[PDB]
Amino acid sequence: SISRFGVNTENEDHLAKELEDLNKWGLNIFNVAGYSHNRPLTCIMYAIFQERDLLKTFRISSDTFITYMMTLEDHYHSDVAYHNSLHAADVAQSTHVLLSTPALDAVFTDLEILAAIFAAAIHDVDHPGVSNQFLINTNSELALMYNDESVLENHHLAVGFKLLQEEHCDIFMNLTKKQRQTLRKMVIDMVLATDMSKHMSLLADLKTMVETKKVTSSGVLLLDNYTDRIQVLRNMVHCADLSNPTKSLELYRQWTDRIMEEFFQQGDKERERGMEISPMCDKHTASVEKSQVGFIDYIVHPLWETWADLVQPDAQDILDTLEDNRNWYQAMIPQNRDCQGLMEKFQFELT
Ligand SMILES: C[C@H]1CCc2c(sc(NC(=O)c3ccccc3[N+](=O)[O-])c2C(N)=O)C1
Ligand SMILES: [Mg+2]
Ligand SMILES: [Zn+2]
Numbered sequence: 001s002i003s004r005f006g007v008n009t010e011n012e013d014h015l016a017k018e019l020e021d022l023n024k025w026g027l028n029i030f031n032v033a034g035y036s037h038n039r040p041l042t043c044i045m046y047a048i049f050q051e052r053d054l055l056k057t058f059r060i061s062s063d064t065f066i067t068y069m070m071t072l073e074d075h076y077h078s079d080v081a082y083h084n085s086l087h088a089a090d091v092a093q094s095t096h097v098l099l100s101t102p103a104l105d106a107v108f109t110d111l112e113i114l115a116a117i118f119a120a121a122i123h124d125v126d127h128p129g130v131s132n133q134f135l136i137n138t139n140s141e142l143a144l145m146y147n148d149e150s151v152l153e154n155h156h157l158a159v160g161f162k163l164l165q166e167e168h169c170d171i172f173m174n175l176t177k178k179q180r181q182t183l184r185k186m187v188i189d190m191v192l193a194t195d196m197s198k199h200m201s202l203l204a205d206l207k208t209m210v211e212t213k214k215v216t217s218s219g220v221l222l223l224d225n226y227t228d229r230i231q232v233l234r235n236m237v238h239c240a241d242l243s244n245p246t247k248s249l250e251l252y253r254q255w256t257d258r259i260m261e262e263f264f265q266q267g268d269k270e271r272e273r274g275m276e277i278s279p280m281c282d283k284h285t286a287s288v289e290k291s292q293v294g295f296i297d298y299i300v301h302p303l304w305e306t307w308a309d310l311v312q313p314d315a316q317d318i319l320d321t322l323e324d325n326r327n328w329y330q331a332m333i334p335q336n337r338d339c340q341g342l343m344e345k346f347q348f349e350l351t
Contacts, residue, residue, distance in 0.1 A: 006046030006066045007036040015043075022047050025097055025247070025318065029090045030254060040089035041076070042069040045121055048096045054117075057110050059174040068169040075126045075159055081261040083127035088120070094240035095120040103221050103311035108229060115183045116233050119190035120240055122160030127152060130266045131278065132195070133347060138273070150195045157191050186230055193234035194241050196346040203303055206235050210309045221310070232310070239307050245292075245300050246322045260288055279341035291341075292329035296322065298339045299346075 001008050009015050015035040021027040022044075033040040046066065049055050055065060076085040095116055099108070108116075128135075132151045136143040146154040161184070164170045172180055193202060209231060214222040223229050244255035260280075267281030280286055304322055308315035 003066065005036070005043055006062070006069070007039040007043045009035055009037065011035045019043075019047055022051060022093070023097060023100060025094075027093060028251065029086060029093060030251070032089070033086050038078075038085075039070070039073060041073040041085040041092070041121065042066065044089040044093050045069050045117075048092065048117060052096075052113060052117075054110070054114055058114060058172075060171045064168055064173070065171055068163065068166070068171045069121075071163050071166055071169055072122060072125060072160065075163065076124070077127065077129065080127060080129035081265065082255070082258040083124045083129055083262065087258075088122070088124055091123060091237070091240045091243075092117055092120040094243045095237055098236045098240060101311050101314045103215070103219065103314050104232070105218075105220050107221055107223050108233070111179055111183060112186065112229060112233060115186040116190060116237060118160075118183075119187040120237055122187075123153075123156055123191050123194050123237065123241065125156050126159045127156070129262050130269065131345075132197075133278070134266055134270070137275065150192050150197075153192050153195045157188055160187075160191075186233065189230055190234050190237045193238050197349045199238070199299065199303070199346060200348045201351045202235060202238055203306060205231065206303075206306050206310065210306055213310065235307065235310075239303060242300055242303060243318075245296055245325055246304060246318045248321065249325055249328060252325050256288065256292070260286070279345040289329045289332040293326060293333065294338060294342060296326040296329075298342055301326070 001010060002012070005012070005015055005019070007015075015032065018028060018031045018035060029040050029044065032043055036043040046069065049060075049065065054060070055062065073085045073088075076083070076088055078084055098104075099113060099116060132143075132148075135151050136148045140151070142155050143151045145151075164172060172183065175183065192198070209228075216222055221232075223232065244252055244259075247255070263278075263281040264283040264286070267277045267283060270277045270281065280291055301322060304315065304319055308319050
């Protein structure tokens with residue numbers, strides 16, 4: 001029923017109401033999902049692009065764009081609990097908001113805007129619901145093909161890009177050859193940066209950026225060159241990928257249930273195979289609450305606190321919500337040694 005929102009629906013009134021919060025951190029993608037015949041990704045990407053006049057700027061037809069997004073959305077596994085199209089929509093919509101932050105006003109080109117939103121949308125496509133390390137230890141075709149390096153993240157790129165070639169799917173058809181090679185380079189860089197094994201190198205570099213930042217007379221970050229811009233961008237996308245815990249508790253509890261169920265599903269495959277069970281993946285032993293606090297203290301808060309620095313005072317509410325959600329889980333509970341599970345799970349790579 002009628003694609004002005006690019007999707008079928010029987011509650012355009014409630015879909016519209018919900019898309020009023022398109023530009024806000026508080027948008028509810030679960031609701032957009034429920035009012036779009038579970039096409040949250042197609043729906044939110046279609047809204048974001050009209051909102052940013054991106055289809056105009058890059059001469060992308062509504063049909064080309066809906067045809068591609070639909071296909072991209074088809075390539076997220078609906079039987080995977082967390083890494084399905086709801087996640088991709090969320091990260092896309094979250095990048096859209098981060099891009100609007102006042103400290104970054106007019107800092108990026110339209111091409112960079114396009115790349116960052118596209119990267120967010122494709123960053124987990126065709127995710128099988130198991131980790132890089134799982135794929136490597138079981139000798140998956142994907143691990144062989146990509147030499148055990150950012151295996152899934154290489155696959156998300158191949159797939160997202162491959163789908164441009166489907167009939168009526170080339171949303172970049174009208175870019176210049178130069179724009180296209182620049183977009184490809186930036187998206188590759190951003191999607192590779194969503195590999196959690198890089199989290200600590202990302203974060204160290206973001207801290208250096210923070211410590212020597214410059215802001216204009218207005219109050220807006222001064223980003224000297226390409227190198228500085230793509231670095232903010234790769235951090236922005238990693239932040240969006242890690243934004244679940246900074247969202248209202250109503251939303252984060254749902255994201256938590258989902259990733260826990262996907263972790264448990266990997267653990268069962270590990271148990272079934274006689275493998276050691278990855279951290280947080282053993283349903284018989286996991287403790288969500290304890291894990292929440294550790295994950296927020298060791299991974300999420302250190303990052304968002306640095307992003308909040310970069311763009312101060314813009315991200316203060318984000319940081320506040322994050323601290324409230326942490327204390328919510330903490331209250332249910334009756335340091336390096338303690339962080340060891342996260343280190344094992346994320347496999348931080350030295351550089
Ligand atoms: C106790 C739970 C709470 C939520 C959570 C985790 S781990 C986690 N996220 C990740 O592990 C993650 C983050 C960035 C990129 C990839 C992943 N991942 O592969 O799961 C979340 C979350 N909702 O983002 C542990
Ligand atoms: Mg990923
Ligand atoms: Zn993701």
